[PDB]
Amino acid sequence: LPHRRFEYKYSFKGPHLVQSDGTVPFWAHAGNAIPSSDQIRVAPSLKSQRGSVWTKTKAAFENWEVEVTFRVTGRGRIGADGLAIWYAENQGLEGPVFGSADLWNGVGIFFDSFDNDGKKNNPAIVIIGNNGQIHYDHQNDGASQALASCQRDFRNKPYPVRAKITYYQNTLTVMINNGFTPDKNDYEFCAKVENMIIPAQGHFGISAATGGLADDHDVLSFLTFQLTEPGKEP
């Protein structure tokens, strides 16, 4: 049983999410990212939109867990483009990768609602490791690069969808609460990457973008925990 420590400096939430001056404490927003007091609309249902929210300093946790609560909402049965959750060496403030910099050093977990390669396999969630050298292939929804994936329709759900992303003993696990019940602990397995290497120090981040189609991309909270192996000390 791993010890769980909450880290406020790498987190944000309602119902006083934003400060009187428009900042999310300890986080930088960019592009067209809109923080209010109950959510951050990362990318609105307007055309060709890009937004990101990243942490201001690097977390140096050997083991961690982040729980991200979100809504992706769109008037249609097909939306675009999707949302990304990141742990990377550098802040990816702006760029073409679901709203942020390409060639990241680390991991991005993409919640891909748009079927760019017409393979009929969306909405999807894909885990993509990068070493600073690979360009995201968005025309194949990262299928040439994906370390692991699953099919979850994370759009237009009755309750906020949740993602639990755990990096523990070199294993990166994604669990998804598919937004059908008010029980926030009804997580189901999505994907697993054993023996994954990611930098010792990185920025956490969240980003979104829209294409021709355009969904609303709302993140209600981003909750970060440090994990300690049974036997050590936090």
């Binding site: 406020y8 119902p15 001056d21």
Partner: protein, 68 residues
């Protein structure tokens, strides 16, 4: 008016916005807040966790908050 104990619980739950009877650093931020530099905000919250949070779990429960 309230007894000393009823006043303690009152100010403990005042910023317990998620109602989980635990105070995290973000809830403390809101209590602590023109605007102070983010560095001084971190220093204060950090000081409070270092002083009050004995099991190092990032939360301050009622017992930790009150002492006695």
């Amino acid at each position: 008016e309230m007894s000393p104990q009823e006043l303690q619980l009152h100010y403990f739950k005042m910023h317990d916005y998620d109602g989980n009877n635990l105070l995290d650093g973000l809830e403390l931020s809101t209590a602590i807040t023109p605007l102070m530099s983010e560095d001084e905000l971190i220093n204060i919250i950090d000081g409070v966790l270092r002083d009050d949070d004995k099991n190092n779990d990032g939360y301050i429960d009622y017992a930790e908050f009150a002492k006695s």
